[PDB]
Amino acid sequence: GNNVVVLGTQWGDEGKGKIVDLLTERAKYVVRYQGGHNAGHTLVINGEKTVLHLIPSGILRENVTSIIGNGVVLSPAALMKEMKELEDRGIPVRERLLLSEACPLILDYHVALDNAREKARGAKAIGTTGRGIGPAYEDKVARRGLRVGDLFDKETFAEKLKEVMEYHNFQLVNYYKAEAVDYQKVLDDTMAVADILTSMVVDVSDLLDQARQRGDFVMFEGAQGTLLDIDHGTYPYVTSSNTTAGGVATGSGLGPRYVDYVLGILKAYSTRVGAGPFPTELFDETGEFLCKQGNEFGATTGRRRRTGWLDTVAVRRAVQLNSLSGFCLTKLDVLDGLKEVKLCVAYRMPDGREVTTTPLAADDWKGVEPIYETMPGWSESTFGVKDRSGLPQAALNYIKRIEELTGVPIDIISTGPDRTETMILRDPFDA
Amino acid sequence: GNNVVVLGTQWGDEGKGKIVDLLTERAKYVVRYQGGHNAGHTLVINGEKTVLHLIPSGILRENVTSIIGNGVVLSPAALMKEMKELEDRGIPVRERLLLSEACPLILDYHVALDNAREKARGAKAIGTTGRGIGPAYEDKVARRGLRVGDLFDKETFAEKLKEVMEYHNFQLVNYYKAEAVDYQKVLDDTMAVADILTSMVVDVSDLLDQARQRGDFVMFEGAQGTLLDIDHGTYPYVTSSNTTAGGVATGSGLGPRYVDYVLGILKAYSTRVGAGPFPTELFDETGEFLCKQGNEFGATTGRRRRTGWLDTVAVRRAVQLNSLSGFCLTKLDVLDGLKEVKLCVAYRMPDGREVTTTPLAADDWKGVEPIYETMPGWSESTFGVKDRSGLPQAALNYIKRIEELTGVPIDIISTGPDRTETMILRDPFDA
């Protein structure tokens, strides 16, 4: 399929990075359709390991164009920051980066609302880099917000700005008892960079359509995990915005029927950071084993990262949400050196019945009890193998089961960090 | 096309009402996926006009099931009011209708918030229909809101309610200088219909996914025109929800690739309600003709609807964004009697450039000039015609032209209100 959507099917940490970097070899265009500055794609450039939260990774490839779609919430600050790091490292971002005029802006007033809405009407918080995403989105929906195109008419931006800022300030000082935001610092901060932001501007939906007719290859890049979806995820413990494939159209302007292939990044075992339901969790020796061997104490880290057997009930739920076509199974080796492996295939509700479909968000998440299917493990290794043949018969049987239960084929088997440590059974773009 | 999507390809009032009740007949499932209680379906129950604003019209048919997807915003008082209204006439509503748990709830302070944002503008009130629709969306994306699900846990409900009501009452009485909405009342009002709502909740993702694999006919129905889209229409002259087809996967939980046919409800000419760009808008008697000939008067205020010729550039935009399959042409006979008839085949910009693509910015829509193509009219009547033969060659070439300019075939021609005055050149379910 020329139009490919790359995304994770669990709660994040599936490790979409290596795969996204690989596909971005054939992609003509790479696109962001949702989220903001919290993508954590890690890179090594000229002996320097940098992390990009906003600019697509494809910005490294010479003949590729990186586009930020209208679904993304934008921070001139965040942007200007990454622009600087890359340009300094010999990469000309301003000539290979394009953005939508419909992208909503995140300015300090927005950030402040997040902190106040957090520290005050809470008590403790850290975030990372999300920061203000939720607010910039609420402004968009109420229709007060400012988009990228407002910057073509510098004057109007100014008055437009002054209005939004007064409302938010009234909220800040009077409700939260926090610092009003100086309107001048912001006008000056945004004005300082308008002209740059406006020259990378383009009609995104028209370009995707020209691309669709010309045959170009396009990769839609998902930034967060499927079960974090504001709407269809495990509410209340859910992310700032829609994470499924249904936001490709909305977020980019490309019609629904042109999505050709949805690659669902799958990690061979489940993990979840922070709280929130996790029916398949391990509270014995296997969990720490998993966390240990898996090295789940970093890589776009967080607080408390648990572990568990794959949940083919929730992964079967991801299959629907995203209309998945194929899996890209990750980190299988971790399950090496074990005697047994299990995969959830049903849950028992706090009432005796066993359902096979993720139940409603409002039933009893911590009540739920998991019915596991048991399978002998493999004592051989796997980290670095590049072939089915030279893959243990036992491991191979874990796969087919992952297929039959989800009813979706595994098409790529990333075995190790390096590129060559990959097994491409079907290739998303050629499919 | 087993899964069919229906929507207005312009700015509203395209005349979807009859195509919907027509296809409803072959449909097993009927689905709402965006908006609120602002659909406006005028139908006749045993010789009595009655407007269902929230409950889908499929409810009338026996072999149908109506579903309120997670994307619709839900007000208990509307639905309660409509059920009693349908039940009092013998339509077993509770047994033919089902809701989703993710449905955001529209309660008193939501309506009370909108009420004020109008009082604060008055003469330049953006005018409103469904009241509260928007403040429910903001509340949902800022994650402070309440879904239909939360009613399941009655202790926690009142807890959340409490919080989100002081945030709002603070604004009502301290910024807007309006009355605070009484919490105890809202809890009491809501606890009354609680047993009733939860009785209708179901797993919409699973249910539709099962229909799809069974091969059942499913119809998705839009409530507002394409150009009002919160992301792709004339900002900020837009609505608070995505209106295009991309919002189907999102406001239902049914993956994108599973949309088969998308049918654009297209009016023979253009109309717009309230503020906003519209270069084909006419300011002559030719304009007013189309006003009177198609009864384009306001229903709840009496206001007039702006009119103008058919604009194929805007229409072409709607094809891009909806990956449009076919057109359902409406109100043609409104042109019956004209000496000449025009079609906007392009926009000429200030610098002198003619483009076949809509502008992005609010301001950009200011200098545009339609480049019209003028064709012969027709004096004979097209109202009620059933076959393509009894159509003047002139209506033939005009219908022909619209296709040449858009690439999308006209698959249905609705020639009036009876079920039978309809030319079905293709049949969306069968194509």
Task: Name the descriptors.
globular, 9-stranded parallel sheet, 3 domains, Adenylosuccinate Synthetase, Chain A, domain 3, alpha/beta, 17 strands, 4-stranded mixed sheet, homodimer, Adenylosuccinate Synthetase, subunit A, domain 2, 31% helix, Adenylosuccinate Synthetase, Chain A, domain 1, 431 residues
Structure, described:
By secondary structure, chain A is an alpha/beta fold. Chain A folds into three domains: 1-100 and 201-265, Adenylosuccinate Synthetase, Chain A, domain 1, CATH 3.40.440; 101-200, Adenylosuccinate Synthetase, subunit A, domain 2; 266-431, Adenylosuccinate Synthetase, Chain A, domain 3 (Alpha-Beta Complex). Helices cover 31% and strands 19% of the residues of chain A. Chain A contains 13 helices and 17 strands. Chain A has helices at 17-23, 76-88, 93-96, 108-120, 133-142, 154-176, 183-191, 194-198, 204-214, 247-252, 285-294, 314-321, 393-406; strands spanning 3-8, 29-32, 41-45, 48-52, 65-68, 97-100, 201-202, 218-221, 261-267, 270-273, 305-308, 310-311, 326-330, 340-348, 354-355, 369-376, 410-414. In chain A, strand 3 (41-45) and strand 4 form a beta hairpin. The longest helix of chain A is centred in the middle third of the chain and has 23 residues, at 154-176. Chains A, B: Substrate binds at residues 299-305. Chains A, B: It is found in: Cytoplasm.
